[PDB]
Each structure stands twice: as C-alpha cells, then as structure tokens.
Structure 1
Amino acid sequence: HKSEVAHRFKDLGEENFKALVLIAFAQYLQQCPFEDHVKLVNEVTEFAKTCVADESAENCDKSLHTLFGDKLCTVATLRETYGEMADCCAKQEPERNECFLQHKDDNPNLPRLVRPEVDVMCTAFHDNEETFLKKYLYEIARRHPYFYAPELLFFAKRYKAAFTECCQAADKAACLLPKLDELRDEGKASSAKQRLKCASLQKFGERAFKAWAVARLSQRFPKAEFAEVSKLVTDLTKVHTECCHGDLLECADDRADLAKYICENQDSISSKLKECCEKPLLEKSHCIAEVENDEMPADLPSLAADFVESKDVCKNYAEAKDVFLGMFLYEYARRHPDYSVVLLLRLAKTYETTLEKCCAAADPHECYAKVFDEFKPLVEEPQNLIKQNCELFEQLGEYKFQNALLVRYTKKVPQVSTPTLVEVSRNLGKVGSKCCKHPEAKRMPCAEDYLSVVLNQLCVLHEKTPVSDRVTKCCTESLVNRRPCFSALEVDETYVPKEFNAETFTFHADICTLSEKEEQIKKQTALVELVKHKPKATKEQLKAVMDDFAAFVEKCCKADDKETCFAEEGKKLVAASQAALG
C-alpha cells in the first residue's frame, strides 16, 4: 500500500512487530536501559497503528530505512554515549543507513549474564510472561548485534516453552537448567556459523560462496533443474551479502521474497517444503533453511558420460566454464547427499584443474580419461576417518572417547593451552555421539556441520594466542582443506617434556562435591598436563595411570575421611606413575 509500516504490521502481527522493533533498536542502542526501548517500541507501534488507520498520515509513506533512521536520531544521548555513531545522524538517506551499519563494533563488553535461582525467574515469568521474554530479547540483542532478529525470535519461542513446562514440574531445576544450557550452546553455535559464513564471503568472494550454495542446494533439491538451482543460488548470494553487510531490513525482505518464491514453485524444487510453506511468513525462511533432503530421481543419467566418457567435454567447457563447472557440482552433489559440501568442492576443484591442463593438451580424451580415479582417494579419506573414529567411539564411552582425542591432539600440538585442548576434544567427542548414531549416508554431512564450527573456534582461539605455525597454516589455508590439514598434523618429535609440577597433580576432597561436568573437566585437564609432561608414554601406560587415577577418586569420594585418603594415597599414585614413566 501507500505506507510500508501498515503492510509489515498487518503482514507480520502486532506482538511479532513489537519484538523485531525491540531487537532492531537494541542492536544499535546497546547502552539505553530496557525501559527506554519499551517506550521506543510503543511510540513506533502506535505510529504504525496511525499508518494502519490513515494510509497517508504525517510521514507514513516514508521507507522503513528512512523511518528507522529518523527515530534512531530522535534519541537524546546519542553522541554522548556511543561516540562516532552520531555523525551518521547528520547525514541523509541512503548514506545515513550505510553510516549506522559501519559504526556497529559488535564487541562492547557488557555485564556478564546474571542467571538467578530457578524459582525467582519462574515467579517473574508467571507474573509477566510478555515483559520477561521482552527483557530476554533486549539482553541477547545488545550482546549479539549481528544476530538475525527473526532467528532470535525462534530462540525466544523455545525460551518460553522451556519456562512454561519446567516452572510447573516438581524439580524445576531438573527440567529448566538443562534446557536453558542447551539453548545457550545452540545460540553460540548459530552465531559462530553466521560469522564463519560471513568471514568466508569476505575472504574467497561471491563466486566461492556461489560454488558452496550450488553443491548444498543440489543436495537438498536433487530434482530441481540446474537453471532453477542457479536462480535460487543467485538470490541466496544477494540475501547472504546484505545480511553479512549488516542490513537487517534488506536481509529480512530478500529472505521473505526468496521464501515466497520457493513456496510458489515447490513441485519444481522439492516435495519436502509442504509443511514449511504451511507456516507464517516469518517461520517460512527458518523452516526452509533446515528443510530435509528430497528423494533423488532413480532414472538419473550416469554423470561420468557428460564429463569423462563424452568427446565434447572441452568444447562444452569452453562455451561457459563456470556454468559447466556449476553443472558438474549440481550433478555430483544431487547424486551424493552422503558427501560433505567440502568433499564435493575438492572434487569440483580437482575436475576444474584437470580440465585446465588436459583440454590444452595434445589428446584431451586420453588425458582426463582416469579423472574419476583421482576422486576415489579424495572420497575414501573422510569415509575412512569417520568409520575408524565412529568404531572407536562404540568401543569406549563418550567421556572415554574424549580422553582418546585428548591424548591424540596433545601429542600432535603440545604447545596449545590445556583449556583450548580440553574444550576442543570434549566438543569433538560430542560430534562422535551426535553423528555415529546415523548410518554412513548421513555421518559425513553431520560431521562437517559440527567440525566446521569446532575447527573455527580453535582457529579464533589460536589467533588470539599464536603458538604453532602448523595450526596457523591449517587456519589460514583453503577452507576446503582446513580439516584435512588438522588430520595430516604429525606428532611433535621436537617437543621437550614439561617439568613435573606438584600443584598441577594435587587434588583434594573438594572434587567429590563437583558436578559430573566439573569433575570430568578437572580429570581431563589433569590428563592433558600428564601428556604434556609424558608425551612419549604409550596408550597402554596412559590408560594404566588414568584407570589407577579413576579407581583412586572413586575409592575416597564418599569414604571414611576423604581429605587424607586423596593426599596420602594420592602421593603413592604419583610415585607409582613416576616409576613406570622414567
């Protein structure tokens, strides 16, 4: 209509409109208290009601960017609080929005999240459900300025459901706390993925993202014609570029436009969009993004015919290299949803390389004949790693598998800080228990998802604390070969053992009153420091000390005087270990 505010309000819903407006303003004004934002939201809401009533009231036909900016400049203490952001309020559209976007340093140290007792929150929730979820969004929004506001709304919907059920049950802490921790982990995991996707765009460029998207969309929509997948990738690239740039308004519009188009052509894209295209406008974008892979046509031509066996390959390559390479990805990706996107890019990379030499050669059809024998090792490598690692995950527990990784990676890079080694290994153990549950046809894509974000946190951690040139090489190299680089890491033979530190290997009765997580991390920290001090001790000898130490703790914890038991007999264990490890 004449006004956009009216449409959006009516196209979305008052309560959802009031939420997005709250997040939108909270992401910029990361200082102004909660009560201030509520006033900002109400003023905007009432204004939108005026726009809903009169389709041409005072400043009602203005664009969202314009209207948003005007209200953002209305704040009194703007240059007196945020600093350079106020110079943007002296500009005009569309440069003013571009300004605001620039001055958005997403690292303003804020008071750490203060989680009270389980009953005070439940009481506050019940008294005012609406405002309890409003304060949730505010506190999160200002802490994650680049977090996609709609995605934060699905995190608030789960937050309500958790509190709605767990505040009614007998043991509220044995329902809520675990559910709250899971969300907090899911939230940081979602955040990390967005910032990784964006960092990759600002490193390898649009063409690189396009290649990633083709491979992924072809896996999800293995029926959709190539011309359709290309058009979806072209829209996804523009959507991803405006979201990484920091424009929530254009990001949310382009996502809505794409969600609408996908839902209007589902018969020509996928049959698995039936229930996603049932939902409201805002949930369409989210549902479609996590949509299950469609079944692949059984009557598919052999992909080796049009790319190797054919004698028009070089001729069909010359016409449009990227189009032809895109078709190769499309055909390979849709035939192999059990492959990681990263593996398919290794194959797509290899094929390009081989066509860039063999097509300029004397006899091409002779040169690139055996190109599919070059993929076999590229495919077998990850498959062999998964099968070998998932087998070992069955043999031991989850915690016992983490101990195996602890030893494995400490021996490889013993210079890395214990906490980084513990955090990485524990996370990597949880990948095993969340992927090995599936069969071979789901494991690799499952692994890729989790490994991508686990390997990036390590790379970010190591960049703040540079320690190994090898780890720097792995983090700075091609994103495709990131995981292979870490896999290829050899045991450090140069490394000289850390000297024995009594403080490091002294435990008390205090450990008995630690949660399973706390206890495990204390024990796993001690294991890393054992390998850093005995890096050439065998899996045999480590297992011996670990078990001797495991039996040691589960022998005085809940025993007649546990304070002396863990000090007196604890010293004997150290001495008993110091006899077998020189």
Structure 2
Amino acid sequence: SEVAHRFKDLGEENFKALVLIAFAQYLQQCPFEDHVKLVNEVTEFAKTCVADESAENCDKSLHTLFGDKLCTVATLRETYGEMADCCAKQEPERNECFLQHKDDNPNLPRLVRPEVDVMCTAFHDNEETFLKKYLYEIARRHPYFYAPELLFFAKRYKAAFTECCQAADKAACLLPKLDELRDEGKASSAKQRLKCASLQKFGERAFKAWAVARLSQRFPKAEFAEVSKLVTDLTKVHTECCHGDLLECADDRADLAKYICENQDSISSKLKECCEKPLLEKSHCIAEVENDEMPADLPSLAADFVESKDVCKNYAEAKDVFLGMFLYEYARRHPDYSVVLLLRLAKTYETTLEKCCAAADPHECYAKVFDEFKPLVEEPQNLIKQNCELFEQLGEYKFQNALLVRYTKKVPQVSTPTLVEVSRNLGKVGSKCCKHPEAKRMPCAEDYLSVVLNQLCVLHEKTPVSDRVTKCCTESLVNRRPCFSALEVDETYVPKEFNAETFTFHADICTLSEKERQIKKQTALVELVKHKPKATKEQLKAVMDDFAAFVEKCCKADDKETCFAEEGKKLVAASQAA
C-alpha cells in the first residue's frame, strides 16, 4: 500500500498539503473549494489504508487513485477543454497527458494585495482556509514549483500573519515580510522550471552533469564518490517532482537532508547551522548553502587527464565515470566559473578525446585541450564585465530598457508581454550581481541568465513564432546564453506599424502601481521598436522621455481626461516624422 506508506512518512498535514498542490498543479482552473473537497476524500481513504493495508483499493498506485479522483471533476470538458483527454486514458498514459498540459501562463487574474486589516481579518476568520488558499493560488500559477519547498513558504506565510496581525503596527510588520516571500518565491519558481526543463527535454544525463558541477563547487572537500551518491539522490528527487510524483519527491528529499546532516564531516563544514533547523527549514537551508572552502593545495589536473598514458584507457573503461571525475575535479577548483561554462568545458574535453583516441598517437593530439578552454572562459567574462559597466552607468530601469530594445531586435516575432517580462527579468541581473567581485560575478550572472532564458524558451514553446528562439532553445541546453548573445538584429523582420489603440494611454494608468505603470511604458516601447526598428537609439530615448512627461502631466491635468488624446495625439505626429 503506497498511500499508507507515504501518509505515515510525511504525516497528515503535509500529506494533505502536497495532495492539494498536486491537484492544483494538474487542474489549474478548478476552483479552490472543488480541490479541497477532493483532497479531503483522498485523505479519508488514506487513513483507511493506514488502519488496514490489505483493505480495498489500498494497493493501487498513487497516480491511479489520485488520477481517478481528479477526473471526477476534470472530465467536464465543457469547462476545462483538452483535460478530459487525459481522463479518457489510464495510468501511466494519463499522468503523462497531465504533465504535457501544465500551463506556464494560465489565463488567471493578477494576485491582489488587500489592506493589511482586510487580510488579518480574513486570516483570523479561518486560519486554515486562509493557508490552503495560499497553497492553491500559488501552485496553480506555478505548476512546476518545487512542491516540498512550497510547504516551507506556507510555513513562513503563516508565521507572518500569526506574528504581524497582533503587532501594534500591523502593516510595518507584515508587508516587508510578504514582499520578501513574493521575491524569493519568484526566484525559486524560475530556478525549478530550469530543473524540470533539463530533465524533461534534455534527459537525466543533463541534470546529472548539472548536479556534479554544482555540488562539487559547493562541496569541494567531499570525495568524488560522495558527490556521486549525492548527485544520484538529488537526481531521483527532482525526477520525481518534475514527473508529478510529489509525495515520493518530498519523502526522498527529507531522507536526503537526513543523510547530509549525519555525514557533514565527509561533505562540508558549512552545514552545522542548517542541520539544527526544523525539517522544512533544514532542507531549505542545505539546498542553498554557501560553498565550502576548497582544500589548500590541489594538484594540477593536467597530470591525470592530459599527460597520463591511460587517459584513453580510462575513457574507454567507463566514459561516464571518467568524464564525471573531470567535471568533478575541474568544478571543485572553480567556484568562480558558472555552471554552464564548466559544462561547455567538459563537452569540449569529451569531444576532444573522442577525436584523439582515434589513432595517430592520441597523446600528442590531446596535448592542448586546455588551450581550447581559454576562449570559452574569456567570452562570458568579458560579457558580464562589459555588462555591469553598462548597468552601473544606467541604473536598472534604463538598463532594462536597453535590453528590451536589443532583444526586441533579436527576436521581434516574440509576443510583447513575453519580451517585457523576460527583459525586465534579464535586466535584474545588474542589481543582483554587479555589486560582486570578479571571482563571484560569473556564476551569479550566467546561471541566472540561463534561468531567465529558460523562461523565454518555455513561454515561447507553448505557441512558437520565432525560428531563432526555437533553435537556441532546442539545440544545446548549456549553450543557450551564448546562442542568444550571438544573435544580431533580425534583418528579415517586417514591421507592422499603423497603431490604433496600442499607444493610446487611458486614465486608469494613474491608479496602477508604479512598476505596473512602467510595464505599460515598456510595453509601448516594444511596439515602437517592433514596428519602427533600426530607429537608432537616440530618438528612442526621445520617444521615451516624451511618454513619461505626457503621463506625468495628463494625470495632473485635473481635466475630464481628454488630455489622454490631447498630448496623446501630439506625440503620434512627432514620433513618425520629425
């Protein structure tokens, strides 16, 4: 009995929370109360099986039981569409159909933040409904969120209302906490979409390679075999979560945290404080721990991987473990290299051996592999450096605007709402990284860029429209950032000017939040480039100044909002001609 085994390992509160997540991530459109109802029926039944494993349907697989239960409300096609397809199939085809239909961008309303009082009240009314509502609204909007990590967010979200709703100043206590959750959640959501993309589109080998490089940078004192044990466990964990085996995911990860804390001494010296925290916090901690110091001396790599006379023999015995050791050994020594660079390096090294081990004295042919890594290291280095300089002398917003133009030009076919979100997010790399030293700037920057570009890829695949986007997204996971950086302006692009209402601001632009106000400013910049590309650089900055003041004043006009036409039509003319 599986549901019995998992129910007792995870305990009831989390079991219930994880089932609700699983339903909310598969049927993102079902209303909240329907999902709660289903989760409760499933929870009644689990207990039945805990009480008797030889009962009833207690011997079924989780996806059969859970899939059957979901389909009691999904099969209604007239309201869910293409999801009744999945309900016509049996496991495991049914689960695969659910995985294919996760929506990275469902047509759901913006999450709104009520007044602090309104929220504390709704919290006090029914604390448990308030929390499940949180789990539900986040999950359906982030169908790939790392499920056990979402439990931790709920925990903190609860603690924020519990504490701040009885502070003297409720707002001053509550708001900065939520803002912090909103921001960390967004980063965590994106980071985990990359994890699942790599698993699902590029396969297990890709995720393992990522894992060896990151855990080795993180745990450079650890023996190689230790890291492999860790890589293997971690790989099963994310394979389970991305495959929608959420109960197994949580359980296996909780065991993983345990194994780590009971063997810190063979892993890292940074884990002491983390391994004292409670269950959820402990696992949040370990997964993001700062890198350990690397051993003081360390050889030279060239000896075991270039000058040895057994390198072809080690490669031929087991490519995987030998290339793994290379990645292990090169990564431990380089916390200053991005994870992607480190993987380009291992691919270059792998490719070189496959060539040189042919014949004609291989030992002579592989002699300069490390001279090939040089330009691969230089390229990202100059990009980040050259970019931080540009950022520091422009400030996030103008930096964001510049990326917005350069990228609209790279791939103008791409929908505007997508260009805006990705650009703003790409631009965020300035604040996040440029503060850093050189020996910390690359992993901070490139891996973050890789996460943002994966968002581009997945928001685009749902409905493809740019060959170039599809090519970079499909061709090689590790090379995405280079493949996008190398794109120049699309010369084939045909502009679609005129206008109509896609430049006529309305009066409700005054009641929206300031960032949300830039979003319709930056939106309109995209339609400006998309239809008048090659408009240099400086009358772009002149049409942007012109949009700002026009909104500043027509919100001050106190008029019958006919100014939103007045200086609305006085820009349309200077914009085109001169």
Change (3 A) 1:521 1:241: closer
Farther off after superposition, 124-133 or 506-515: 506-515
1:300-326 deviations in Å (ceiling 9; x for gaps): 111223223444433433333221111
Q: Is contact 2:75–2:87 with CA below 8 Å preserved after alignment?
A: no
Q: Is contact 2:224–2:328 with CA below 8 Å preserved after alignment?
A: yes
- How much does 1:273 deviate? 1.4
CA distance in 2, matches of 1:469, 1:85: 29
- How much does 1:478 deviate? 0.7
Q: Is contact 1:224–1:268 with CA below 8 Å preserved after alignment?
A: yes
Q: Is contact 2:74–2:83 with CA below 8 Å preserved after alignment?
A: no
Q: Is contact 1:12–1:281 with CA below 8 Å preserved after alignment?
A: no
Change (3 A) 1:312 1:52: closer
- How much does 1:447 deviate? 2.4
Change (3 A) 1:434 1:175: farther
1:24-61 deviations in Å (ceiling 9; x for gaps): 67667989986787788788889999999999999999
CA distance in 1, matches of 2:64, 2:492: 62
> Structure 1 residue 283 and structure 2 residue 242: aligned?
no
CA distance in 1, matches of 2:21, 2:528: 47
CA distance in 2, matches of 1:76, 1:370: 60
CA distance in 1, matches of 2:67, 2:13: 22
CA distance in 2, matches of 1:213, 1:118: 42
Could you tell me which runs of 5 or more consecutive residues in structure 1 were left unpaired when the two chains were aligned: none
Q: Is contact 1:407–1:528 with CA below 8 Å preserved after alignment?
A: yes
Provide TM-score, normalisation by structure 2. Answer: 0.82
CA distance in 2, matches of 1:51, 1:118: 43
Change (3 A) 1:253 1:419: closer
- How much does 1:460 deviate? 2.5
Farther off after superposition, 34-43 or 316-325: 34-43
Q: Is contact 1:217–1:233 with CA below 8 Å preserved after alignment?
A: yes
Secondary structure, counterpart of 1:217 in structure 2: helix
1:252-274 deviations in Å (ceiling 9; x for gaps): 33223322222221111111111
Change (3 A) 1:57 1:545: closer
- How much does 1:351 deviate? 0.6
In structure 2, the residue matched to 1:476 is 474
Q: Is contact 2:9–2:251 with CA below 8 Å preserved after alignment?
A: no
CA distance in 2, matches of 1:94, 1:516: 47
CA distance in 1, matches of 2:503, 2:473: 33
Change (3 A) 1:441 1:90: same
CA distance in 1, matches of 2:300, 2:392: 37
Farther off after superposition, 179-188 or 150-159: 179-188
Change (3 A) 1:82 1:558: closer
Q: Is contact 2:305–2:311 with CA below 8 Å preserved after alignment?
A: yes
CA distance in 1, matches of 2:101, 2:416: 36
Change (3 A) 1:111 1:266: same
CA distance in 1, matches of 2:86, 2:557: 67
In structure 1, the residue matched to 2:386 is 388
1:170-201 deviations in Å (ceiling 9; x for gaps): 78667756754664564455444434323322
- How much does 1:539 deviate? 2.0
Secondary structure, counterpart of 2:80 in structure 1: coil
Change (3 A) 1:484 1:562: farther
CA distance in 2, matches of 1:76, 1:458: 29
Q: Is contact 2:20–2:136 with CA below 8 Å preserved after alignment?
A: yes
- How much does 1:422 deviate? 1.6
1:536-562 deviations in Å (ceiling 9; x for gaps): 222233223323443444455435759
- How much does 1:433 deviate? 1.5
1:133-185 deviations in Å (ceiling 9; x for gaps): 13433555566666554222112112223334554567866775675466456
CA distance in 2, matches of 1:427, 1:311: 48
- How much does 1:288 deviate? 1.8
Farther off after superposition, 192-201 or 399-408: 192-201
- Percent identical: 100
Q: Is contact 1:498–1:532 with CA below 8 Å preserved after alignment?
A: yes
- How much does 1:393 deviate? 0.8
Q: Is contact 2:3–2:46 with CA below 8 Å preserved after alignment?
A: yes
1:239-293 deviations in Å (ceiling 9; x for gaps): 3333333222332332233222222211111111112222334444332222221
- How much does 1:73 deviate? 11
Q: Is contact 2:104–2:458 with CA below 8 Å preserved after alignment?
A: no
Q: Is contact 1:512–1:558 with CA below 8 Å preserved after alignment?
A: no
CA distance in 2, matches of 1:460, 1:217: 26
Could you tell me which runs of 5 or more consecutive residues in structure 2 were left unpaired when the two chains were aligned: none
- How much does 1:436 deviate? 1.7
Secondary structure, counterpart of 1:386 in structure 2: helix
Change (3 A) 1:213 1:573: same
CA distance in 1, matches of 2:51, 2:501: 72
Farther off after superposition, 66-75 or 132-141: 66-75
Farther off after superposition, 423-432 or 26-35: 26-35
Change (3 A) 1:201 1:100: closer
Farther off after superposition, 359-368 or 163-172: 163-172
Q: Is contact 2:270–2:290 with CA below 8 Å preserved after alignment?
A: yes
1:318-362 deviations in Å (ceiling 9; x for gaps): 333221111110111111112121111100000111111122242
- How much does 1:498 deviate? 3.6
CA distance in 2, matches of 1:76, 1:540: 53
CA distance in 1, matches of 2:144, 2:529: 40
CA distance in 2, matches of 1:86, 1:412: 39
- How much does 1:506 deviate? 3.6
In structure 2, the residue matched to 1:409 is 407
CA distance in 2, matches of 1:202, 1:573: 48
Question: Alignment RMSD, CA only?
Answer: 4.6
CA distance in 2, matches of 1:176, 1:490: 46
Change (3 A) 1:524 1:250: closer
Q: Is contact 2:74–2:84 with CA below 8 Å preserved after alignment?
A: no
- How much does 1:381 deviate? 0.9
In structure 1, the residue matched to 2:571 is 573
1:204-245 deviations in Å (ceiling 9; x for gaps): 332222222111111111110112112222222333333333
CA distance in 2, matches of 1:550, 1:516: 12
Match of 1:338 among 333, 336, 339: 336
1:108-138 deviations in Å (ceiling 9; x for gaps): 9888867655433321212332342134335
- How much does 1:386 deviate? 0.8
Match of 1:168 among 148, 166, 169: 166
Farther off after superposition, 143-152 or 435-444: 143-152
Change (3 A) 1:517 1:330: same
Match of 1:132 among 130, 142, 147: 130
Change (3 A) 1:389 1:100: closer
In structure 2, the residue matched to 1:562 is 560
CA distance in 2, matches of 1:398, 1:515: 18
1:475-534 deviations in Å (ceiling 9; x for gaps): 111111111111111112333444343644444655444421132122212222222333
Larger Rg: 1
Change (3 A) 1:386 1:36: closer
Match of 2:266 among 268, 271, 292: 268
- How much does 1:376 deviate? 1.1
Q: Is contact 1:133–1:160 with CA below 8 Å preserved after alignment?
A: yes
Provide TM-score, normalisation by structure 1. Answer: 0.82
Change (3 A) 1:59 1:199: closer
Q: Is contact 2:408–2:419 with CA below 8 Å preserved after alignment?
A: yes
CA distance in 2, matches of 1:336, 1:468: 36
In structure 2, the residue matched to 1:225 is 223
CA distance in 2, matches of 1:293, 1:487: 29
Q: Is contact 2:15–2:247 with CA below 8 Å preserved after alignment?
A: no
Size of the alignment, in residue pairs? 578
Q: Is contact 2:472–2:480 with CA below 8 Å preserved after alignment?
A: yes
In structure 1, the residue matched to 2:322 is 324
In structure 1, the residue matched to 2:538 is 540
- How much does 1:438 deviate? 2.3
Farther off after superposition, 360-369 or 7-16: 7-16
- How much does 1:78 deviate? 11
Farther off after superposition, 74-83 or 424-433: 74-83
Match of 2:255 among 242, 254, 257: 257
CA distance in 2, matches of 1:409, 1:98: 34
Report 1 or 2 for greater relative contact order, CA contacts < 8 Å, sequence distance ≥ 6: 2
Q: Is contact 1:340–1:448 with CA below 8 Å preserved after alignment?
A: yes
CA distance in 2, matches of 1:70, 1:572: 61
CA distance in 2, matches of 1:85, 1:557: 45
Q: Is contact 1:509–1:562 with CA below 8 Å preserved after alignment?
A: no
Farther off after superposition, 282-291 or 299-308: 282-291
Farther off after superposition, 142-151 or 236-245: 142-151
- How much does 1:95 deviate? 12
